[PDB]
Amino acid sequence: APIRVGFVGLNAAKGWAIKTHYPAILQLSSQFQITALYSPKIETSIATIQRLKLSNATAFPTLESFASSSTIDMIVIAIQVASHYEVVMPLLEFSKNNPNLKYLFVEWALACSLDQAESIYKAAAERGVQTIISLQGRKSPYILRAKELISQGYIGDINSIEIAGNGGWYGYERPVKSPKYIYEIGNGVDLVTTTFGHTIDILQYMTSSYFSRINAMVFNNIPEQELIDERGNRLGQRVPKTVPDHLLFQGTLLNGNVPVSCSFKGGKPTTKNLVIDIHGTKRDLKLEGDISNLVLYYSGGKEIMEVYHLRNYNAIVGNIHRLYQSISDFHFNTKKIPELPSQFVMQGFDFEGFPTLMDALILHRLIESVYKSNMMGSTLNVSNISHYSL
Amino acid sequence: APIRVGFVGLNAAKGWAIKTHYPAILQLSSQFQITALYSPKIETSIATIQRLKLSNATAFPTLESFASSSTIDMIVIAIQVASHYEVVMPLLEFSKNNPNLKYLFVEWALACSLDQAESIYKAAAERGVQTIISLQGRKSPYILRAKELISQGYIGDINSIEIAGNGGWYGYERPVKSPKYIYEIGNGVDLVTTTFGHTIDILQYMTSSYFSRINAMVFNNIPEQELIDERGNRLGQRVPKTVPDHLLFQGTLLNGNVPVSCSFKGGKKFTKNLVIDIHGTKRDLKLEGDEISNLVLYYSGYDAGKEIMEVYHLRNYNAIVGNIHRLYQSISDFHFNTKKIPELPSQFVMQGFDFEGFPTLMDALILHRLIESVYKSNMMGSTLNVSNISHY
């Protein structure tokens, strides 16, 4: 009994679902089957079902028909964040005509605001389905290895943490091929919501702790970006940006009152794309990007440096792949654990399962708080965002 | 010609004045001469004047006699910060009996609190003497080279800055041989006041900007330190610390609203002790040390790529004595006008961001206001506007 997958945002010729979700589902052909597909232009659906040989997938005409169908067990939404609310709300409502629906899978970010995120959570929860959020960083071999080392005491207690990252396209330059919408505030995609969001979430996941207090400063020091061509050359035309080009973030982890210092540049470096330095009482641990490297440093007049590196791990489809596998594994209870619940509220810091919309919701609360902290100009108590309900 | 110097805190057998100030004055024997010396135990003064062959120095019995003497042109105070206020205040008062006094040289930190610092500044200012503060980092060859590059546009506009450092002695351990007062709050020596103070001051000096807004979190996560021996082994005895073991600091530079992120540990086997990363629109600049001991500048059939790294490194440079030496040098050059450029008064309020001169008690005061604000930010849990701290 293969999980039947209804897909919104899959296009064989365009988009990133074809580049991440599809390869994963293709490899787990046993555990998953695409039985439904929807998009405004019913053509590309049909086109895709053909171009990919999806002999079980039928192209639905309306969102209503799509959502009502009973040939669907898991719905995946892989469209722009700005469209999440407008699509998911009605979808969840029509969903009520599908007695078989068990799963709703949404990409991060969940929505364009905490308000929206809360509405979607509420609607999903009052729908009864198990939810998944694409925080696929939680499935990285590197993240999982670092989480084990830390929780098993190899690091000792954590003294302090530093993080330095880049957001890619939020510096001085903008590829002409890049959609305006992702540079306008409130469209659910930006340096803080997205890049910092994925990163600060894996940080909490790895150290198994939420924050107690935070302070942030959010910058738009680059209100106008220079258009560039494919070759990297400027086109002599400026365009406006209302999303941030820098984030300064500092805070304390609840567990141990651990100092965390973080700096995210919008743009590009004249280096490593991401570094997370975790300083322990027994060892230091470092994760590095272009999350493709894990370093462990310690001592027996002698220093030891140990480097964990996978080749050739493709993180992009690989992390998603493992998320898809988790959904199968929790579903089919493969480890055959009697106690395992049929559904959970949230992964939290568990190795098990997969992050849900509640994990997404808590992250949204942290992101809202980052922006609030900047606006208010004060350090904020965020100790209860994981458990207040709300 | 020679600048006549009276010294409080110089001891040929003990202390750091003998290790930093003395070597400097020894080398500039022409421009400087030690004509006076004072300490509570009049013996060690006499001992030192002998053990060093200071044939012009006389050992004064009281602070009053010392400060009143007219054989003194520049007074140097190199004693523990906790003693600065109690010594300098009366000294400045007795100082009035010395028509020749032109200079007052004090080490950082100026005092144990902003309140004290303001009193000292006020008393010094209403005394008329030119003041110097030992922010000798402003005289490092690495700092000056970085400042020059930045000021000349070599890195473009500053986009952002990160600073990571350690304070050395405020981690999970303390040497049994170590002075208790270094670890007790309010004695004018600590991770924020001292280590962060020297560092954040050179940052502002190199970028020629003060801060607009700041937020800090100050930690005492290590209320009890483990005593260690000379070999590095623990003695199985814990002692209390009320000074911080970590500082998180973030803020914006007034000029350009530049994001600055900073983390100082109290507190790997082969790391760097201090790194300042300055990211420019054209080039990146990095200063590192285990003190500053290295400056690096970085620029960046199919389409080619060219990277250029320049490293500036003076091997065998003793920053400790070197920096203080270069401070003394900058003093006499002002004093003797070695640049021979008139007309320049025999006195200025503050170095500010000038390459010229040397930092004064006003530069110290402004730094104290910043340090005071770091602690306020932490206690209030607010981001503070410090834009006006450099005014009077």
Helices (H), ranges, B38-166? 42-51, 63-68, 81-94, 114-125, 141-151
Longest dimension (CA), chain B: 81
Please tell me the experimental approach by which this structure was elucidated. Answer: X-ray
- How many helices (H) and strands (E) would you count in chain B? 9, 18
Contact B284 A303 (CB under 8 A): no
Q: Which residues contact A65 (CB under 8 A, 6 or more apart)?
A: none
Determine phi and psi for B269, rounding to 5 degrees.
-100, -40
Q: Which residue of A has its CA nearest to B269?
A: A303
C-alpha distances out from residue A130 to A94, A272, A318, B255, Å: 17, 37, 23, 51
Contact A379 B160 (CB under 8 A): no
C-beta of residue B147 within 8 angstroms of C-beta of residue B208: yes
Return the sign of the alpha-carbon dihedral for residues B8, B14, B15, B21.
positive
Q: What does the buried/exposed string (b/e) look like for A278-289 if buried means 16 or more CB atoms within 10 Å of the residue's CB?
A: bbbeebbbbbbb
**A273–chain B nearest CA distance, Å:** 14
Selection from B33, B43, B44 nearest residue B10 by Cα: B44
For B162, the closest of A164, A172, A260 (CB atoms) is A164
Q: How many other CB atoms are there within 10 angstroms of residue B237's CB atom?
A: 11
**A177–chain B nearest CA distance, Å:** 20
Residues A348, A204: Cα–Cα separation, whole Å: 9
Give which of B383, B384, B387 to mutate to test A binding, by max A Cβ within 10 Å: B383
C-beta of residue B216 within 8 angstroms of C-beta of residue B371: no
Cα B289 → chain centroid: 16
Q: Which residues contact B29 (CB under 8 A, 6 or more apart)?
A: none
Give which of A157, A247, A270, A296 to mutate to test B binding, by max B Cβ within 10 Å: A270
Resolution (A): 2.1
Contact A263 B221 (CB under 8 A): no
C-alpha distances out from residue A126 to A92, A95, A319, Å: 10, 12, 29
Residues of B with CB below 8 A from A159's CB? 221, 265, 267
Residue type, B206: M
Tokens of B239: 């002692």
C-beta of residue B196 within 8 angstroms of C-beta of residue B250: no
Residues B333, B335: Cα–Cα separation, whole Å: 5
Return the sign of the alpha-carbon dihedral for residues A332, A336, A338, A339.
negative
Residues of B with CB below 8 A from A279's CB? 265, 268
Tokens of A127: 């729908």
Contact B279 A263 (CB under 8 A): no
Compute the radius of gyration of chain B from its Cα atoms: 22
Contact A267 B159 (CB under 8 A): yes
Residues of A with CB below 8 A from B258's CB? 221
**B227–chain A nearest CA distance, Å:** 16
Q: Which residue of B has its CA nearest to A269?
A: B279
Determine phi and psi for A279, rounding to 5 degrees.
-100, 120
**Collapsed DSSP state (helix, strand, coil) of residue A224:** strand
C-beta of residue B182 within 8 angstroms of C-beta of residue B169: yes
Domains present along chain B, CATH in parentheses: 1-139+315-360 (3.40.50.720), 140-314+361-392 (3.30.360.10)
C-beta of residue B183 within 8 angstroms of C-beta of residue B225: yes
Residue type, A68: S
Residues B174, B238: Cα–Cα separation, whole Å: 9
Residue A33 is inside which H or E element, if any?
A: strand A32-38
C-alpha distances out from residue B180 to A346, A353, B60, Å: 49, 52, 30
Residues A270, A288: Cα–Cα separation, whole Å: 17
Tokens of A23: 């390869």
Contact A221 B257 (CB under 8 A): yes
For A270, the closest of B258, B265, B300 (CB atoms) is B300
Residues of B with CB below 8 A from A301's CB? none
Residues A152, A208: Cα–Cα separation, whole Å: 12
**A267–chain B nearest CA distance, Å:** 10
Residue type, B91: L
Contact B248 A259 (CB under 8 A): yes
Residue A75 is inside which H or E element, if any?
A: strand A74-77
In chain B, at which residue ranges do the beta strands (DSSP E only) sit? 3-8, 32-38, 58-60, 74-77, 103-107, 130-134, 158-166, 173-175, 211-219, 224-228, 234-240, 246-253, 258-265, 274-280, 284-289, 294-299, 308-312, 384-385
Place of tokens 């308000």: A115
C-beta of residue A297 within 8 angstroms of C-beta of residue A286: yes
